[PDB]
């Protein structure tokens, strides 16, 4: 007849498993693909474009237009992601160092890690112990990196492995064909002599034949990371369940929901206030379209690589808006807020919205002395007490008291501002309707938002807080004046 499904379980978060998403998983998670670089439609209504940025299938950011994925308003919409396909793979700046590290660990030809079998077994045994800590993992990664950089030839395929270093910005160079002051290897001589046709057609190649090492563009790095054996992935200290080496190079961008990027319709002019993320995404999509157009139209290799570098730089700025090795001609003109900027700083999420955040049901007033109050009491102005409400639950003890409070209404000081019914959660404003009937219909379990009355425990604080006694709980007593008053003997803790 009816299937038994559990309504709600008191689920508690146990732990957070950090990780990475492969390009396939990004498409699976996302709802739509963003391909239009424009934002609004041509018509004067300026509705957001379809399959472009600000599409309301990615949530909503305006109180009037609901989300298209889930038919809910701005208050209830959790937001939904989209995905943007990149024509050319680009290095993830946040993982760039990691990429370099991994490129140092493994062979550049057979993709195996630079470790002997005995050292492999030893490191696996050391990693297999239970209770491995984050510091232990970092130390093991450092030791393995040192011992891998000790070697120079491959025990698996025999290919030479030179040094891998960061040249320029977001570019990796592998010194495969290093100069040998001693007798030269056949490989380097063959590589040097393979430039015969290029030298014949371009003489300038010959003076610059030196310093011509292997360049690991994101395509080659992605291809190499796709061929790393899964056995050696734990030896890179990377959790196989969390992610894979191929995930370090991004080919899809998860464009965030509209809730992260609010848009303000400033109808006073013909424009809107948009955050930096939307403009960065617009520029990235424009660059993808430009690269595709250049590939179609047969452009030079120099400008193709320039557009690829521009796309990499734009992705890095979208992730982190404060980089160092930016070329002066490639430097941004103005200042944009990347995700790192939104996270770090005194106004970031952690310090400005997570560790310490603004609250309601609070007030801030000038103080004046009052010696006639006990040291555990504080005088609250009548005006503030009429605003700061306490939700008192109707029980068998305070029913006759809450009835009188409801009868008084929101104007007389001992009284209430709202009534929340037990069965239906529809709040009732006490300024309207017959208050006597509402008082006569007070059921047990109803919530009455009573005014702050005498005896209520109230926190009292001086904002420059040095020690724990800078904030204390007092008992509120309502007084006709407009200042917070307390006994002067309590001045010394608050300073």
């Amino acid at each position: 007849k009816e299937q038994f499904r559990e309504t709600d379980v008191a689920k508690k978060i146990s732990h957070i498993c950090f990780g990475m998403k492969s390009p396939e998983e990004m498409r699976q998670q996302a709802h739509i693909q963003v391909v239009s670089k424009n934002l609004y439609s041509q018509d004067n209504q300026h509705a957001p474009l379809l399959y472009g940025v600000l599409d309301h299938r990615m949530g909503t950011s305006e109180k009037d237009r609901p989300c298209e994925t889930c038919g809910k308003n701005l208050a209830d919409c959790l937001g939904h992601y989209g995905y943007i396909d990149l024509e050319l793979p680009c290095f993830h700046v946040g993982y760039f160092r990691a990429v370099i590290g991994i490129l140092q660990m493994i062979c550049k030809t057979c993709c195996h890690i630079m470790l002997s079998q005995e050292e492999k077994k030893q490191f696996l045994d050391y990693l297999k112990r239970p209770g491995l800590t984050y510091l232990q993992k970092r130390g093991l990664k450092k030791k393995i990196s040192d011992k891998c950089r000790k070697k120079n030839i491959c025990h698996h395929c025999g290919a030479f492995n030179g040094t891998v270093k960061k040249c320029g910005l977001l570019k990796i160079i592998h010194e495969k064909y290093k100069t040998n002051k001693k007798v030269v290897d056949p490989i380097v001589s063959n590589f040097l002599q393979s430039f015969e046709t290029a030298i014949e057609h371009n003489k300038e190649v010959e003076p610059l034949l030196g310093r011509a090492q292997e360049n690991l563009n994101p395509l080659v790095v992605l291809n190499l990371f796709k061929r790393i054996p899964a056995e050696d992935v734990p030896l890179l200290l990377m959790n196989p369940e969390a992610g894979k080496p191929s995930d370090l190079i991004l080919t899809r961008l998860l464009v965030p929901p509209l809730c992260i990027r609010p848009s303000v319709v400033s109808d006073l002019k013909s424009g809107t206030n948009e955050d930096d993320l939307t403009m960065k995404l617009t520029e990235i999509i424009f660059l993808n379209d430009v690269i595709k157009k250049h590939r179609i139209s047969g452009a030079k290799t120099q400008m193709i690589m320039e557009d690829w570098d521009f796309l990499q730089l734009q992705c890095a700025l979208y992730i982190n808006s404060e980089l160092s090795g930016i070329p002066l001609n490639m430097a941004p003109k103005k200042w944009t807020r990347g995700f790192v900027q939104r996270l770090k700083g005194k106004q970031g999420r952690f310090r400005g919205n997570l560790s310490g955040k603004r609250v309601d049901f609070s007030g801030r007033t000038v103080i004046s002395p009052d010696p006639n109050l006990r040291i555990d009491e504080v005088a609250v102005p009548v005006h503030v007490a009429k605003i700061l409400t306490f939700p008192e639950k109707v029980n068998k003890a305070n029913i006759n008291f809450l009835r009188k409070l409801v009868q008084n209404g929101p104007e007389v000081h001992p009284g209430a501002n709202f009534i929340q019914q037990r069965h239906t959660q529809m709040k009732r404003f006490l300024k309207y309707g017959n208050r006597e009937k509402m008082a006569q219909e007070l059921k047990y379990g109803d919530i009455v938002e009573r005014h702050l009355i005498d005896g209520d425990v109230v926190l009292f604080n001086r904002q420059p807080s040095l020690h724990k006694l800078s904030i204390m709980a007092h008992l509120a007593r309502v007084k006709p004046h407009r200042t917070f008053r307390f006994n002067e003997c309590v001045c010394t803790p608050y300073n």
């Binding site: 508690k12 978060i13 952690f350 997570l354 560790s355």
Partner: protein, 39 residues
Amino acid sequence: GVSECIIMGIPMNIGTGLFKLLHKADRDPNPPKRPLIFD
């Protein structure tokens, strides 16, 4: 840790959250079981 408890919006382990409270309800643990006739 305390900071992650604050971020996740869960009661922190230190302070009043170290212990757990039980209700001294009128009860009988391991109540008598109705016998099975067919088995």
